[PDB]
Amino acid sequence: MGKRVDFSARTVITPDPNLSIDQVGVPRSIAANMTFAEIVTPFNIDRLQEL
């Protein structure tokens, strides 16, 4: 019913009024560790190659 999951981070929250309600600020350390899998396509092939 509940279990540990990959691709999850946790840290302390702090206020920030200078971003919309749908935005959330995350540190570069967290963003540089958690990954998202993009499928290559001729549209983004050059961008992903550079990445």
Partner 1 sequence: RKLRRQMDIIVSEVSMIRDIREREIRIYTDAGRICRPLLIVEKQKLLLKKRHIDQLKEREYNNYSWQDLVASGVVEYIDTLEEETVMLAMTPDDLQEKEVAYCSTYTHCEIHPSMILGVCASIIPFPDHNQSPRNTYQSAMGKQAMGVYITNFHVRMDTLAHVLYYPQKPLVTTRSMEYLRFRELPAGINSIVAIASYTGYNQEDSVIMNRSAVDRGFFRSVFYRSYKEQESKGFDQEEVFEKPTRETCQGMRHAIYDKLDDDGLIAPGVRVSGDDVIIGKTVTLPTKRDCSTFLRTSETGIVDQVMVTLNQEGYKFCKIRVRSVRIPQIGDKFASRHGQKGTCGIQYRQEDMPFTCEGITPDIIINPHAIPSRMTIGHLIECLQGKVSANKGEIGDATPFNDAVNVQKISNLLSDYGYHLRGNEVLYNGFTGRKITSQIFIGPTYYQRLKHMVDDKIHSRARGPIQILNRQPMEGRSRDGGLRFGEMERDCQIAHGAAQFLRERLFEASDPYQVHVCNLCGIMA
Partner 2 sequence: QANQKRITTPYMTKYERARVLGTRALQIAMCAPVMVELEGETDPLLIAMKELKARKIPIIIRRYLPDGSYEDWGVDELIISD
Partner 3 sequence: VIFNRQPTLHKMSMMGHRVRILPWSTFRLNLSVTTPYNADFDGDEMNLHLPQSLETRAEIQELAMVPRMIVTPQSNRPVMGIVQDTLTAVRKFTKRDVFLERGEVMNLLMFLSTWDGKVPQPAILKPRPLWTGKQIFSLIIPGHINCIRTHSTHPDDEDSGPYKHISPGDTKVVVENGELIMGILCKKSLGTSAGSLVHISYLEMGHDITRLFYSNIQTVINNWLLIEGHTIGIGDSIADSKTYQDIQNTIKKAKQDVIEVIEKAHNNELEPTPGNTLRQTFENQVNRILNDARDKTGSSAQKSLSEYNNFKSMVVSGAKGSKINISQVIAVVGQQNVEGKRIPFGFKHRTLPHFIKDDYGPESRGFVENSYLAGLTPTEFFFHAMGGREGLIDTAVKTAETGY
Q: Which of 37, 42, 43, 46 binds partner 3 (CB under 8 A)?
A: 37
Q: Does 42 bind partner 2 (CB under 8 A)?
A: yes
| Residue 6 C-beta: closest distance to partner 3, Å | 8
Whether residue 4 is annotated as binding a ligand: the answer is yes
Determine the Cα–Cα distance for residues 14 and 49; give it in Å rounded to an integer.
36
Query: Are 30 and 9 spatial neighbours (Cβ–Cβ below 8 Å)?
Result: yes
Asked if residues 38 and 44 have their Cβ atoms less than 8 Å apart, the reply is yes
Provide the binding-site residues for partner 2, judged by CB under 8 A. Answer: 38-39, 41-44, 47
Q: Binding site membership for DNA: which residues?
A: 4
